[PDB]
Each structure stands twice: as C-alpha cells, then as structure tokens.
Amino acid sequence: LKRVAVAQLCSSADLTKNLKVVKELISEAIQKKADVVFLPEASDYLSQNPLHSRYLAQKSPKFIRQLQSSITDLVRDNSRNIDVSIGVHLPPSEQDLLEGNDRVRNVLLYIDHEGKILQEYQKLHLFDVDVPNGPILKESKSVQPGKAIPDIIESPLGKLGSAICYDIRFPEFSLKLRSMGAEILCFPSAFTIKTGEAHWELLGRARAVDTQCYVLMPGQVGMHDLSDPEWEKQSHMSALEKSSRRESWGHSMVIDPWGKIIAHADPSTVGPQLILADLDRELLQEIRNKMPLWNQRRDDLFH
Amino acid sequence: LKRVAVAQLCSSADLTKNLKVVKELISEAIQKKADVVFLPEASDYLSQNPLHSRYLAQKSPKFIRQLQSSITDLVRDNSRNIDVSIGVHLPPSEQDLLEGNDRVRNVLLYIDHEGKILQEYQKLHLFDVDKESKSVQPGKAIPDIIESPLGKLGSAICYDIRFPEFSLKLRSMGAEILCFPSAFTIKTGEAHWELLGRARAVDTQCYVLMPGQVGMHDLSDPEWEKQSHMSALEKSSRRESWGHSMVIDPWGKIIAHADPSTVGPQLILADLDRELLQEIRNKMPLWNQRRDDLFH
C-alpha cells in the first residue's frame, strides 16, 4: 500500500497568505506519512479579471521558489521525503510576448523532495463556458493553452498522469494517459458550484472506471476573497468593480479503479483540509487482469 | 418533442417465445405513441454456450423475417408508424465458413416502419471478461449515423459502452442520440451501469438510451440438449441480468427509468427535446474545444 494526500483549499488573491496555507497542508501530509501530496489548480492565486491574473502571475515565480525551499525545509526537519503536485500560474515567456501572447500559463507543477521541479504541465483545455444560470466565463482571455501532452511521472505512488480541471471533460486525454502507462490520474481543479453539483463526482468516477486508474481530485472550495487593494489602487478600480463572488465546489476525493470513492472531504469545513488514502497496486492489477480493456481496443478503427 | 420507447425484457433460449414478447412490446410502444422503440442486446435468444449459440443462430434469420412482417402488420393495424432498434444474432455467412470463421454475429438491427433493415451493426468490442469471442466474431465497421424520427442516432452494443472513443466518434459523426442495448451482469451492473450511461451522455452531450435485459434467465432447451447428447452436469442454463433500463438527457439527468417493482417485460417512455440538446451544446461547446492537434 502507498499513502497519498489530497488537499482542499480556498485560494485568495494574496500569494503570501496562500503560501502559508499550502505550507501547512504539506507539513500535515508529511506528518501523516503521505508519499505525495496533491493540491488544487490555482493554489498560488485566483484573480478578479484577466488583467489581475497577469499582474499576479508576475509574483508566482517567487511563490514557487519559496515553496521549493519550504518543501526541502520540511523534508529536512521531518527526516522524511515527500513529493508535491500543485497548480500554479506562470507569466508568458519572451517568445510568447514576441508572438503577441501576453497570457499566463496555467501550470501543474510536480516538485520532488529535493525541491526539484520535474514537470510543468500547461493546461490544454481552457474553461470557456456559459455556466447554466450563471456567468459567462472565458479562461482563454487570461490563460494561454498548452501545446504538449504531459509525460507520465514515475512517482513514489506509481505511474502518474497529470491533468487540470476542464481537461477532465475530454475522455481521449485520460485514455491517452492510460495508454502511455498511467496507474493514477489527477485532476486538480477550481470547479464551479453549478457544474460541480451536476458532474464533479460523475466525471471523476467515470474517468477512473474508463481508465482503470486511481483518480485524485484536489479541489478549490468556498467563496474566494479576491481582494487586492494595492492592485485595485494601481488599476484605478472603483468599489463598484471591486466585489468578486467566485465560489468553488470542493468535495475533494480519491477514487479507486473500480469507481469507488475511498476518501472524501468533510463537508462541514469550508477551510483548508487534507484527505488521505492508501493506494493498492494489487487491486489495480487485479481489476486490469479481470477486464483487460487495453488488450481489447479497436485501434484499427479509432485513432 | 419526439417520443422514444425503451424496452426491458428477459430472453430465454426459445426464439418463438421471445418473438411474442418483442411483438407485444412493439405493440405497446405504438399504443403509447412512441416514434422509435429500442430493445436490448440478444432479444432473439440467449444461449448456454458457444455450441448452443451456433445452433440458435441458424434460427435467427426466420425470427428476423417474421419480425419484419410483424412490424408492418402492427404499423398497419394501429395506423401509426414506428421504427425498431433491436439486438439479434446472425449465423456466419457461407463465405465466413469457407474462411474459417465459424462464429455468430452479435448484431443491432434498425428496422423502419416499412419493415426494411436500414442498418446491421455488428458488435465491435466483445465481452471477454472475468468469453464472447469463443462464439462471436467482432465487427469490421463503425456504424453510420441513422437519420431516425427522433434525430441523429449513433448505435452501439453493450460492452461497446466501455470504450469512450467509440461514443466520441459517433458524436463527431453527428450523433444526437446514442443507444447501448445490453445484457449486463449483476456485479458490473450494480457498479457501473448507471455511471457509464450518464458519463457517455455528459461526455458526448447526447441523449443516451439504455435498453437492458433483466432478471433470472432460463436458457433450457431440451431439444438441443437431447440432440447434443448432453449430460445434466454440463448444463449451463442460468444467467442473471441487471435491468435498470433508462433514458438519460445530454446533461446526465435520468429522465425515464425502469420500475424496479415490475417483474418481466416493460416499456419506459421519454419525450426528447432537441432545443435542450442544442442549448447544452451552445453553452459548453466541447466539440469546438477538442485538441485534435494532439489527440486526433
């Protein structure tokens, strides 16, 4: 058995305050002897609008450097290793800017116990949706889409396939990750209330059953405090344009390859929390042996 | 709104008795003003073993021809059109035999109100799980979208539901409605039946139709057993199916579902809403957002 931790949190626009929460959750994860801890999409910050996002992304590299140090400090002080998967943002590159693309990168980082970044997965499918009885959201206004399929990570838990949030709606992506050798999929997310209530548990369980993988679902939760007086000052924003009522679904969970929820967030808390699960490689292998889906595909017709 | 009927039934090894049930369900569907009725996988028969199946499949062409006549009879008697989607078996062709492929075909027929077979979909993914491929030959083709009275229909069978790329392709081809006629086991039924149907609906933004076999089957066939000189120790005449036939909207809402308290053959009805489908697709334009550059 291999122990995983999945974090649920409520990001603000304040990267210093978010880092403190992140550090506490990683610290708890090590104390509970989790081999890897998974944190949600946008754990560095959430923003008020596309201009705010670009502003905050300029602060994310320092957040990441501080996180790398915090991880190594915690590993040193606990005499125990942990790896960290965490959603952040990164500013555009020089080449991006040269091409007229000043949008931020929505990135899932994998950081090992030595503070080394092993992967930066840039989100492929961006959240451009008219929410039913809700706001029109267009992630592509602030975020640039990725151009790479993420490599399978050989983590302490097993072979890991990485995805972010709306990526979960595109089954061919999860199928590809399994085809490449994934045993575990993660979907760190900031999921809406409306689509969360409808589809969050369904999609997680569906992906698990489709791919015969463990599925980890770290989610944002609660009403986000997006306030940034210093940026609001700089942007000349009126109090009228200042309020931001973004709310995330939470219900962070761990799902087995048969679609059984084996760990789930406590609904009684809307603050940060950690859930733990023990992953069973023998169960995963048994499930795949009994129903050998990857030996039964019609590649002659599909793809 | 267009009205669909989804049938739930329990096949024996007796094609004559199965035909009677199928005809009654089609009759009931016409009475309830359904424009198309969908029946499960293996509505002609279920078999004890591969040798039994090869024997029963020889009887399937007559079943189909009699069903074709019965559909035109029922349409004409009731003075109302209906189309029929129904899972049957077909024996290997003469050419199949000469090629060494002495296996039956698991086929989904689409039969229109004129009794004409518009599609013969041969199952692509065979149920080999802890072995269908012992008796059954896999299909060679993706089925065309059918322009049905309800809208654009994509067809599949049973285990096919477990391979999301198939359903995704049918949507890419223009499906508005997907069907998964099935004989689903109890163990995987309890675990996955509702999950898989809802997932395919949400994945593809299609109405999903789930006609299932239900209950305990008796596959006894004394005449075959005598001809085969079979010992009673070798009989394998019990099967159990999950039922829970349902209709699911493009948002994953179950809008019709089999009544658990009704034993044996039953129909469920739903009125399909093309405008609802269009609204869902407009608000979350998944097919304008796929990464074909990387995946397709």
Side-chain angles (χ1 to χ4, degrees), chain B residues 211-225 227-243:
Chain B
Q213 297 275 346
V214 71
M216 184 190 69
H217 303 269
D218 176 16
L219 307 175
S220 286
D221 186 345
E223 182 165 42
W224 171 74
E225 285 155 27
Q227 275 186 217
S228 303
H229 308 302
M230 205 164 179
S231 85
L233 262 303
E234 289 175 316
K235 267 195 73 175
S236 182
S237 56
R238 183 198 177 90
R239 189 167 167 157
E240 290 185 63
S241 295
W242 178 243

mmCIF file of all heavy atoms in Angstrom, chain B residues 211-243, unseen atoms left out:
data_model
loop_
_atom_site.group_PDB
_atom_site.id
_atom_site.type_symbol
_atom_site.label_atom_id
_atom_site.label_comp_id
_atom_site.label_asym_id
_atom_site.label_seq_id
_atom_site.Cartn_x
_atom_site.Cartn_y
_atom_site.Cartn_z
ATOM 1 N N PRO B 211 -31.430 0.222 -23.166
ATOM 2 C CA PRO B 211 -32.316 -0.939 -23.035
ATOM 3 C C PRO B 211 -31.541 -2.144 -22.516
ATOM 4 O O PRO B 211 -30.561 -2.566 -23.135
ATOM 5 C CB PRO B 211 -32.791 -1.197 -24.476
ATOM 6 C CG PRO B 211 -32.210 -0.075 -25.318
ATOM 7 C CD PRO B 211 -31.032 0.436 -24.567
ATOM 8 N N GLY B 212 -31.980 -2.697 -21.391
ATOM 9 C CA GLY B 212 -31.290 -3.838 -20.797
ATOM 10 C C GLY B 212 -32.167 -5.062 -20.602
ATOM 11 O O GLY B 212 -33.372 -4.946 -20.339
ATOM 12 N N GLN B 213 -31.555 -6.235 -20.741
ATOM 13 C CA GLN B 213 -32.134 -7.481 -20.248
ATOM 14 C C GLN B 213 -32.260 -7.363 -18.731
ATOM 15 O O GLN B 213 -31.485 -6.645 -18.103
ATOM 16 C CB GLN B 213 -31.218 -8.664 -20.567
ATOM 17 C CG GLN B 213 -30.979 -8.942 -22.044
ATOM 18 C CD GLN B 213 -32.056 -9.805 -22.668
ATOM 19 O OE1 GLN B 213 -32.858 -10.424 -21.968
ATOM 20 N NE2 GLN B 213 -32.075 -9.853 -23.993
ATOM 21 N N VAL B 214 -33.215 -8.079 -18.146
ATOM 22 C CA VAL B 214 -33.432 -8.045 -16.697
ATOM 23 C C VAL B 214 -33.740 -9.423 -16.111
ATOM 24 O O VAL B 214 -34.377 -10.250 -16.761
ATOM 25 C CB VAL B 214 -34.586 -7.077 -16.325
ATOM 26 C CG1 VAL B 214 -35.943 -7.645 -16.753
ATOM 27 C CG2 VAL B 214 -34.574 -6.746 -14.826
ATOM 28 N N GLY B 215 -33.278 -9.654 -14.883
ATOM 29 C CA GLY B 215 -33.734 -10.786 -14.075
ATOM 30 C C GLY B 215 -33.046 -12.101 -14.357
ATOM 31 O O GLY B 215 -32.008 -12.143 -15.034
ATOM 32 N N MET B 216 -33.626 -13.178 -13.824
ATOM 33 C CA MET B 216 -33.063 -14.511 -13.987
ATOM 34 C C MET B 216 -33.600 -15.161 -15.254
ATOM 35 O O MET B 216 -34.818 -15.278 -15.436
ATOM 36 C CB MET B 216 -33.346 -15.394 -12.761
ATOM 37 C CG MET B 216 -32.696 -16.779 -12.843
ATOM 38 S SD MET B 216 -33.256 -17.911 -11.562
ATOM 39 C CE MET B 216 -34.948 -18.191 -12.052
ATOM 40 N N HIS B 217 -32.672 -15.562 -16.120
ATOM 41 C CA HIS B 217 -32.979 -16.223 -17.380
ATOM 42 C C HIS B 217 -33.000 -17.731 -17.180
ATOM 43 O O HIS B 217 -32.256 -18.266 -16.356
ATOM 44 C CB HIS B 217 -31.907 -15.902 -18.424
ATOM 45 C CG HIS B 217 -31.717 -14.438 -18.674
ATOM 46 N ND1 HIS B 217 -32.405 -13.755 -19.651
ATOM 47 C CD2 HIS B 217 -30.914 -13.531 -18.071
ATOM 48 C CE1 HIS B 217 -32.035 -12.487 -19.640
ATOM 49 N NE2 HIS B 217 -31.134 -12.323 -18.689
ATOM 50 N N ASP B 218 -33.859 -18.403 -17.934
ATOM 51 C CA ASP B 218 -33.830 -19.855 -18.020
ATOM 52 C C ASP B 218 -33.526 -20.203 -19.472
ATOM 53 O O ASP B 218 -34.373 -20.045 -20.355
ATOM 54 C CB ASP B 218 -35.162 -20.463 -17.568
ATOM 55 C CG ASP B 218 -35.209 -21.982 -17.744
ATOM 56 O OD1 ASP B 218 -34.143 -22.617 -17.933
ATOM 57 O OD2 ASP B 218 -36.321 -22.543 -17.700
ATOM 58 N N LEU B 219 -32.326 -20.669 -19.737
ATOM 59 C CA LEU B 219 -31.852 -20.946 -21.079
ATOM 60 C C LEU B 219 -31.963 -22.397 -21.526
ATOM 61 O O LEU B 219 -31.322 -22.819 -22.443
ATOM 62 C CB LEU B 219 -30.448 -20.432 -21.251
ATOM 63 C CG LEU B 219 -30.341 -18.954 -20.848
ATOM 64 C CD1 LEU B 219 -28.983 -18.458 -20.897
ATOM 65 C CD2 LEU B 219 -31.213 -18.084 -21.645
ATOM 66 N N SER B 220 -32.796 -23.130 -20.791
ATOM 67 C CA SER B 220 -33.054 -24.533 -21.053
ATOM 68 C C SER B 220 -33.579 -24.698 -22.463
ATOM 69 O O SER B 220 -34.266 -23.884 -22.972
ATOM 70 C CB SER B 220 -34.065 -25.090 -20.050
ATOM 71 O OG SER B 220 -33.471 -25.261 -18.773
ATOM 72 N N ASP B 221 -33.233 -25.787 -23.089
ATOM 73 C CA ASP B 221 -33.563 -26.087 -24.462
ATOM 74 C C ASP B 221 -33.489 -27.631 -24.586
ATOM 75 O O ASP B 221 -32.500 -28.142 -24.955
ATOM 76 C CB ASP B 221 -32.613 -25.304 -25.389
ATOM 77 C CG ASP B 221 -32.957 -25.440 -26.888
ATOM 78 O OD1 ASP B 221 -33.703 -26.309 -27.198
ATOM 79 O OD2 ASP B 221 -32.483 -24.705 -27.705
ATOM 80 N N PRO B 222 -34.553 -28.310 -24.216
ATOM 81 C CA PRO B 222 -34.492 -29.768 -24.129
ATOM 82 C C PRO B 222 -34.193 -30.407 -25.459
ATOM 83 O O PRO B 222 -33.388 -31.283 -25.484
ATOM 84 C CB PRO B 222 -35.854 -30.152 -23.635
ATOM 85 C CG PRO B 222 -36.599 -28.989 -23.548
ATOM 86 C CD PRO B 222 -35.736 -27.814 -23.542
ATOM 87 N N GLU B 223 -34.772 -29.908 -26.526
ATOM 88 C CA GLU B 223 -34.491 -30.430 -27.835
ATOM 89 C C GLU B 223 -33.016 -30.340 -28.251
ATOM 90 O O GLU B 223 -32.468 -31.273 -28.734
ATOM 91 C CB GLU B 223 -35.374 -29.704 -28.827
ATOM 92 C CG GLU B 223 -35.268 -30.123 -30.222
ATOM 93 C CD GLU B 223 -36.414 -29.618 -31.089
ATOM 94 O OE1 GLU B 223 -36.877 -28.441 -30.993
ATOM 95 O OE2 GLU B 223 -36.844 -30.414 -31.923
ATOM 96 N N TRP B 224 -32.374 -29.214 -28.026
ATOM 97 C CA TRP B 224 -30.940 -29.067 -28.280
ATOM 98 C C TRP B 224 -30.114 -29.968 -27.365
ATOM 99 O O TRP B 224 -29.144 -30.589 -27.807
ATOM 100 C CB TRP B 224 -30.484 -27.614 -28.119
ATOM 101 C CG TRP B 224 -28.987 -27.471 -28.154
ATOM 102 C CD1 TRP B 224 -28.183 -27.570 -29.253
ATOM 103 C CD2 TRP B 224 -28.116 -27.225 -27.041
ATOM 104 N NE1 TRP B 224 -26.869 -27.393 -28.897
ATOM 105 C CE2 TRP B 224 -26.798 -27.180 -27.545
ATOM 106 C CE3 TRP B 224 -28.324 -27.031 -25.667
ATOM 107 C CZ2 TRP B 224 -25.685 -26.955 -26.722
ATOM 108 C CZ3 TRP B 224 -27.220 -26.800 -24.849
ATOM 109 C CH2 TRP B 224 -25.913 -26.764 -25.379
ATOM 110 N N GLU B 225 -30.504 -30.024 -26.094
ATOM 111 C CA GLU B 225 -29.808 -30.832 -25.095
ATOM 112 C C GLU B 225 -29.825 -32.324 -25.460
ATOM 113 O O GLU B 225 -28.823 -33.021 -25.283
ATOM 114 C CB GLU B 225 -30.408 -30.601 -23.708
ATOM 115 C CG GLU B 225 -30.003 -29.258 -23.076
ATOM 116 C CD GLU B 225 -30.998 -28.756 -22.042
ATOM 117 O OE1 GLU B 225 -31.698 -29.579 -21.417
ATOM 118 O OE2 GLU B 225 -31.086 -27.518 -21.853
ATOM 119 N N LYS B 226 -30.958 -32.790 -25.984
ATOM 120 C CA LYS B 226 -31.098 -34.170 -26.451
ATOM 121 C C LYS B 226 -30.245 -34.437 -27.695
ATOM 122 O O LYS B 226 -29.480 -35.404 -27.726
ATOM 123 C CB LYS B 226 -32.568 -34.507 -26.716
ATOM 124 N N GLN B 227 -30.369 -33.573 -28.702
ATOM 125 C CA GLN B 227 -29.553 -33.641 -29.921
ATOM 126 C C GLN B 227 -28.046 -33.616 -29.647
ATOM 127 O O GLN B 227 -27.277 -34.305 -30.318
ATOM 128 C CB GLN B 227 -29.907 -32.493 -30.870
ATOM 129 C CG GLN B 227 -31.088 -32.759 -31.794
ATOM 130 C CD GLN B 227 -31.298 -31.646 -32.816
ATOM 131 O OE1 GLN B 227 -32.434 -31.307 -33.153
ATOM 132 N NE2 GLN B 227 -30.203 -31.072 -33.309
ATOM 133 N N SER B 228 -27.636 -32.821 -28.661
ATOM 134 C CA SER B 228 -26.226 -32.700 -28.285
ATOM 135 C C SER B 228 -25.744 -33.857 -27.403
ATOM 136 O O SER B 228 -24.558 -33.928 -27.067
ATOM 137 C CB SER B 228 -25.979 -31.370 -27.565
ATOM 138 O OG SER B 228 -26.376 -30.276 -28.370
ATOM 139 N N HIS B 229 -26.670 -34.751 -27.042
ATOM 140 C CA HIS B 229 -26.422 -35.858 -26.097
ATOM 141 C C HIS B 229 -25.745 -35.360 -24.814
ATOM 142 O O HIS B 229 -24.786 -35.955 -24.312
ATOM 143 C CB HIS B 229 -25.636 -36.999 -26.764
ATOM 144 C CG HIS B 229 -26.236 -37.476 -28.051
ATOM 145 N ND1 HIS B 229 -27.523 -37.971 -28.138
ATOM 146 C CD2 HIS B 229 -25.731 -37.529 -29.308
ATOM 147 C CE1 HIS B 229 -27.781 -38.310 -29.389
ATOM 148 N NE2 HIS B 229 -26.710 -38.053 -30.119
ATOM 149 N N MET B 230 -26.279 -34.258 -24.296
ATOM 150 C CA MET B 230 -25.692 -33.519 -23.186
ATOM 151 C C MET B 230 -25.970 -34.197 -21.850
ATOM 152 O O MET B 230 -27.066 -34.705 -21.629
ATOM 153 C CB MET B 230 -26.281 -32.107 -23.174
ATOM 154 C CG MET B 230 -25.425 -31.052 -22.513
ATOM 155 S SD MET B 230 -26.028 -29.420 -22.984
ATOM 156 C CE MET B 230 -24.904 -28.362 -22.077
ATOM 157 N N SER B 231 -24.973 -34.207 -20.968
ATOM 158 C CA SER B 231 -25.182 -34.665 -19.592
ATOM 159 C C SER B 231 -25.647 -33.493 -18.726
ATOM 160 O O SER B 231 -25.196 -32.355 -18.908
ATOM 161 C CB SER B 231 -23.920 -35.317 -19.012
ATOM 162 O OG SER B 231 -23.024 -34.364 -18.462
ATOM 163 N N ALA B 232 -26.551 -33.785 -17.793
ATOM 164 C CA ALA B 232 -27.143 -32.774 -16.916
ATOM 165 C C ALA B 232 -26.099 -31.989 -16.122
ATOM 166 O O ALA B 232 -26.321 -30.824 -15.784
ATOM 167 C CB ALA B 232 -28.157 -33.413 -15.986
ATOM 168 N N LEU B 233 -24.963 -32.627 -15.840
ATOM 169 C CA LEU B 233 -23.840 -31.973 -15.160
ATOM 170 C C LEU B 233 -23.204 -30.846 -15.979
ATOM 171 O O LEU B 233 -22.541 -29.969 -15.423
ATOM 172 C CB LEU B 233 -22.763 -32.999 -14.776
ATOM 173 C CG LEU B 233 -22.704 -33.585 -13.356
ATOM 174 C CD1 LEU B 233 -22.573 -32.493 -12.282
ATOM 175 C CD2 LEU B 233 -23.884 -34.502 -13.066
ATOM 176 N N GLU B 234 -23.416 -30.880 -17.292
ATOM 177 C CA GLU B 234 -22.812 -29.911 -18.212
ATOM 178 C C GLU B 234 -23.749 -28.763 -18.613
ATOM 179 O O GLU B 234 -23.313 -27.805 -19.259
ATOM 180 C CB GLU B 234 -22.268 -30.622 -19.456
ATOM 181 C CG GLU B 234 -21.032 -31.470 -19.183
ATOM 182 C CD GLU B 234 -20.570 -32.263 -20.393
ATOM 183 O OE1 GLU B 234 -21.423 -32.855 -21.096
ATOM 184 O OE2 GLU B 234 -19.344 -32.298 -20.639
ATOM 185 N N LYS B 235 -25.025 -28.860 -18.232
ATOM 186 C CA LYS B 235 -25.992 -27.780 -18.462
ATOM 187 C C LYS B 235 -25.540 -26.476 -17.814
ATOM 188 O O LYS B 235 -25.037 -26.474 -16.690
ATOM 189 C CB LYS B 235 -27.379 -28.157 -17.936
ATOM 190 C CG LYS B 235 -28.305 -28.788 -18.969
ATOM 191 C CD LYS B 235 -29.759 -28.793 -18.496
ATOM 192 C CE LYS B 235 -30.387 -27.396 -18.545
ATOM 193 N NZ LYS B 235 -31.839 -27.411 -18.203
ATOM 194 N N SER B 236 -25.722 -25.374 -18.538
ATOM 195 C CA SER B 236 -25.389 -24.041 -18.045
ATOM 196 C C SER B 236 -26.505 -23.072 -18.425
ATOM 197 O O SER B 236 -26.315 -22.173 -19.250
ATOM 198 C CB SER B 236 -24.050 -23.580 -18.626
ATOM 199 O OG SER B 236 -23.693 -22.310 -18.117
ATOM 200 N N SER B 237 -27.667 -23.255 -17.804
ATOM 201 C CA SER B 237 -28.891 -22.600 -18.260
ATOM 202 C C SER B 237 -29.321 -21.368 -17.451
ATOM 203 O O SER B 237 -30.330 -20.738 -17.775
ATOM 204 C CB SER B 237 -30.033 -23.618 -18.337
ATOM 205 O OG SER B 237 -30.215 -24.259 -17.086
ATOM 206 N N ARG B 238 -28.557 -21.026 -16.414
ATOM 207 C CA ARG B 238 -28.846 -19.842 -15.602
ATOM 208 C C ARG B 238 -27.991 -18.644 -16.013
ATOM 209 O O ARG B 238 -26.773 -18.751 -16.159
ATOM 210 C CB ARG B 238 -28.647 -20.128 -14.104
ATOM 211 C CG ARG B 238 -29.004 -18.951 -13.177
ATOM 212 C CD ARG B 238 -28.375 -19.121 -11.797
ATOM 213 N NE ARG B 238 -28.641 -17.992 -10.899
ATOM 214 C CZ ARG B 238 -29.691 -17.913 -10.084
ATOM 215 N NH1 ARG B 238 -30.588 -18.893 -10.050
ATOM 216 N NH2 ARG B 238 -29.848 -16.852 -9.300
ATOM 217 N N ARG B 239 -28.652 -17.509 -16.208
ATOM 218 C CA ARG B 239 -27.980 -16.224 -16.357
ATOM 219 C C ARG B 239 -28.800 -15.175 -15.598
ATOM 220 O O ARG B 239 -30.002 -15.348 -15.401
ATOM 221 C CB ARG B 239 -27.831 -15.859 -17.843
ATOM 222 C CG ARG B 239 -26.948 -14.643 -18.108
ATOM 223 C CD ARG B 239 -26.582 -14.501 -19.580
ATOM 224 N NE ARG B 239 -25.997 -13.189 -19.860
ATOM 225 C CZ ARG B 239 -25.197 -12.918 -20.888
ATOM 226 N NH1 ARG B 239 -24.863 -13.870 -21.754
ATOM 227 N NH2 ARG B 239 -24.727 -11.687 -21.050
ATOM 228 N N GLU B 240 -28.143 -14.106 -15.156
ATOM 229 C CA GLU B 240 -28.822 -13.003 -14.473
ATOM 230 C C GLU B 240 -28.424 -11.672 -15.096
ATOM 231 O O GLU B 240 -27.243 -11.433 -15.331
ATOM 232 C CB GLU B 240 -28.458 -12.976 -12.988
ATOM 233 C CG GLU B 240 -29.020 -14.100 -12.151
ATOM 234 C CD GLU B 240 -28.701 -13.912 -10.679
ATOM 235 O OE1 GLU B 240 -29.168 -12.911 -10.087
ATOM 236 O OE2 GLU B 240 -27.965 -14.749 -10.121
ATOM 237 N N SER B 241 -29.410 -10.813 -15.357
ATOM 238 C CA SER B 241 -29.156 -9.504 -15.959
ATOM 239 C C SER B 241 -29.650 -8.368 -15.067
ATOM 240 O O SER B 241 -30.613 -8.535 -14.312
ATOM 241 C CB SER B 241 -29.799 -9.406 -17.347
ATOM 242 O OG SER B 241 -29.200 -10.313 -18.258
ATOM 243 N N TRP B 242 -28.998 -7.211 -15.192
ATOM 244 C CA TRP B 242 -29.169 -6.090 -14.260
ATOM 245 C C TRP B 242 -30.473 -5.298 -14.425
ATOM 246 O O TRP B 242 -31.023 -4.793 -13.443
ATOM 247 C CB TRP B 242 -27.954 -5.154 -14.351
ATOM 248 C CG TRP B 242 -28.022 -3.933 -13.470
ATOM 249 C CD1 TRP B 242 -28.053 -2.630 -13.879
ATOM 250 C CD2 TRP B 242 -28.050 -3.903 -12.036
ATOM 251 N NE1 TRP B 242 -28.099 -1.793 -12.789
ATOM 252 C CE2 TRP B 242 -28.098 -2.547 -11.647
ATOM 253 C CE3 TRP B 242 -28.041 -4.892 -11.043
ATOM 254 C CZ2 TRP B 242 -28.147 -2.150 -10.305
ATOM 255 C CZ3 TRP B 242 -28.085 -4.496 -9.707
ATOM 256 C CH2 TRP B 242 -28.138 -3.136 -9.353
ATOM 257 N N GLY B 243 -30.957 -5.172 -15.658
ATOM 258 C CA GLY B 243 -32.134 -4.350 -15.922
ATOM 259 C C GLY B 243 -31.821 -2.876 -15.737
ATOM 260 O O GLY B 243 -30.835 -2.389 -16.275
#
